[PDB]
């Protein structure tokens, strides 16, 4: 097997590089935020052999209640916010209650909900022919934070109005930048398997140097100063027993070193962003601080290679760029009807209007309990990144830019046995100033036909 350490091509001299000031500043850093004095200090008062799981997962929802509750307080629309335990004092007046969604019960009379807060639990009944019945029905059923306006009854809270953590439609626009800059969003590379679209990848690397086919690509590529990788750089180890006969590179150091030789072709003026994943030799539990210190030694050696956290909010030119991968899309298309993998953006709208990444538990990804919920989108996100479905779609929701990143491997038998058609060689060229999709690059000609 090869090691990908031979592809060394210098950039084309005919391609003009623009020398300009490149600001860079990350906002969500797991080192200074959580693990500084909150993650190592959870309880410190227990037996000789105690657990730190009851408190982390206990406060994990309390932090979400404080953050999302603060978001509801920032919105000048929700009013009369009370606790569930305070509903016994109010006789008939309608109030707002904020709580978790335990389950969802469907009945001919209407929708019976089980809302539990840190103070109490009550059943929130809402009619079927309601205006907010669609939002409350299509919402995330296992875990969600909701608010209701209504009055309690004989033990069942008869709510009238629904409130979800949706982004505000009314938002202040961003000032126009003096210099134009673009960005590329890509993930699901999966280096290490025998079905990798190596051709589209090397033509893509050669395309990054300035070897463009059309004249329009020169103006955009000449101003690209940032590259972002979502995750899933390898095929994974330990998923299915028939993977050893498929992994072309069974050595993990050759995958990290191979990936390092494949990524070193990017010029130095382009800022690199490397985010960890769940298939690589790193922390498979979300959230993910970064890579390990054994296998990521050549990556740490490269100063240009920046190992960002997962998730990470990268603020560029005053823009909040939420970088994450998640698995909420599959939970939506598998749990909410009328949703499929062919339209992943539609599944991403539900995740956008909840300010969370992956609230559904039980899917094929471990969730690590933390005393502070970090997956809550506090500030107004300008970009929402996701994937794991290999279908790229463009959709803007309430001025928020929604797009996918695609993949770089051909369709496998595993992908064939689950009835999902991947879309490899999808390179979306987005704009940083306008925070919208600028161009779409499709190298599907070099890949397999879907």
């Amino acid at each position: 097997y090869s090691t990908y350490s031979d592809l060394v091509i210098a950039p084309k001299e005919g391609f003009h590089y623009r020398a300009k000031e490149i600001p860079d500043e990350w906002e969500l850093a797991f080192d200074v935020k959580n693990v500084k004095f909150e993650v190592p200090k959870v309880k410190n008062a227990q037996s000789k052999e105690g657990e730190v799981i009851i408190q982390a997962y206990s406060s994990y929802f309390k932090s979400r209640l404080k953050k999302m509750r603060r978001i509801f307080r920032e919105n000048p629309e929700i009013g009369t916010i009370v606790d569930i335990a305070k509903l016994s004092y109010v006789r008939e007046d309608d109030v707002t209650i904020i709580g978790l969604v335990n389950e969802k019960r469907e009945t001919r009379k209407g929708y019976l909900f089980e809302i539990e807060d840190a103070t109490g639990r009550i059943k929130v009944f809402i009619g079927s022919d309601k205006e907010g019945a669609n939002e409350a029905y299509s919402t995330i059923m296992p875990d969600s934070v909701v608010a209701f306006r209504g009055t309690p009854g004989k033990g069942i809270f008869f709510a009238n109005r629904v409130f979800l953590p949706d982004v505000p439609k009314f938002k202040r626009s961003k000032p126009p930048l003096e210099e134009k800059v673009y960005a590329i969003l890509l993930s699901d590379i999966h280096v290490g398997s025998n079905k990798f679209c190596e051709e589209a990848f090397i033509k893509f690397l050669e395309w990054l140097n300035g070897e463009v086919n059309s004249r329009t690509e020169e103006e955009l590529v000449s101003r690209i100063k940032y590259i972002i990788i979502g995750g899933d750089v390898v095929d994974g180890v330990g998923i299915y027993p028939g993977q050893y006969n498929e992994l072309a590179i069974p050595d993990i150091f050759d995958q990290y070193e191979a990936l390092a030789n494949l990524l070193k072709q990017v010029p130095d003026h382009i800022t690199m962003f490397i985010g960890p994943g769940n298939h690589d030799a790193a922390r498979t539990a979300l959230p993910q601080p970064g890579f390990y210190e054994e296998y990521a030694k050549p990556l740490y050696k490269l100063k240009n290679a920046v190992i960002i956290s997962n998730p990470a909010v990268i603020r560029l030119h005053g823009r909040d760029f939420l970088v994450a991968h998640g698995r909420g899309i599959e939970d939506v298309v598998d749990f909410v009807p009328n949703r499929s993998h062919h339209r992943p953006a539609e599944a991403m709208v539900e995740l956008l209007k909840l300010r969370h990444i992956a609230p559904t538990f039980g899917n094929k990804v471990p969730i690590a309990p933390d005393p502070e919920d970090t997956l809550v989108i506090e500030s107004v996100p300008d970009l929402f990144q996701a994937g794991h479905v290999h279908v790229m779609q463009y959709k803007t929701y309430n001025g928020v830019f929604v797009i996918n990143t695609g993949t770089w491997q051909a369709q496998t038998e595993f992908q064939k046995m689950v009835n999902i058609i991947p879309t490899p060689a999808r390179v979306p060229i987005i704009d940083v100033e306008t925070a919208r999709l600028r161009a779409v690059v499709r190298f599907d000609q070099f890949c397999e036909g879907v």
Binding site: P40, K41, N44, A45
Partner: protein, 249 residues
Amino acid sequence: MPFEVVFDGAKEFADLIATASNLIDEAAFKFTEEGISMRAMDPSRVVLIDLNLPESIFSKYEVEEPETIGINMDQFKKILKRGKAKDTLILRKGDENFLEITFEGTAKRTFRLPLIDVEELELELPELPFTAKVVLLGEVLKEGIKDASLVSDAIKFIAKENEFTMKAEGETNEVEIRLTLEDEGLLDLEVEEETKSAYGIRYLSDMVKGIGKADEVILRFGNEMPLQMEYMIRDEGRLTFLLAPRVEE
């Protein structure tokens, strides 16, 4: 390979086997013409054991060819459990891979145990200055560690010019053990510069459980340097321990 060695006393060596068994679980005492040594680490990565016992400690010392054998700490620990120091410890190994432990005391007890094939990787230890070497007794370490380990789990070692202190903090229970040269528990100080470091007292508990009362204990460590603690046996033998510092809070 066959060799025989007669060491007088059984309890003094049983303290070494007790300290080793409480600090390591699998070790293979390597036998050289200079004496019995063992450079190994606990399989849980907590301490680092280095036993150096010259032939001067042993009464009779007869070697044919230097070789290495493996000894279980548990079984050999149970042998010298009730072994009186007034006996005569005898180690004999012949052609076969058996160990003969003859006791010539109030009752001759010729013993036999198999010797397993330990695959211990002989690893050495590098050399570098620590700038903090102290000479303290053993009992002061006993009462100083067994009392602070109940209020906290990590202890902080700080040594200055003619000053020694070991303070440990916690939620609502602080402690410190300050000693100087004019005290009665600190023998000597070779501190040259300011030294401060943090370690885990939970390792120091079992690490010092096997120490004596009048045994001179020498500690060598640094700021970011690991912890070293060595002490002599019958004024000639040397037992050195080295543990990595705590990278946590």
